[model samples]
Target: SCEPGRTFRDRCNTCKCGADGRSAACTLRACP
Candidate 1:
């Protein structure tokens, strides 16, 4: 229910239900 554009490393850390969907999402770098 996220991923308005699915960005990472530049902030938002990526998005989801897309993070678990796919992509490199680091909530704050290695943010498990």
Candidate 2:
């Protein structure tokens, strides 16, 4: 997870962006 203004790594399986950015969930069963 990253602070409201910070950015997270795209490769991270579980990550979150604070109130400023939209939260994302990786629902895919598998990733390459």
The TM-score leader among the candidates is 2
1-32 per-residue lDDT for model 1 (tens digits): 34544553544353333435444434544445
Least lDDT summed over 10 consecutive residues: which range in candidate 2? 22-31
Clashes of 1: 1
Q: What's the TM for model 1?
A: 0.16
| TM-score, cand. 2 vs. native | 0.23
Question: How does residue 11 of candidate 1 score in lDDT?
Answer: 45
lDDT by residue for model 2 over 1-32, one digit each (tens)? 34664545565454546675656544333457
Stretches off by above 4 angstroms in model 1 are: 8-24, 27-32
Query: How far off is residue 22 in model 1, in Å?
Result: 10
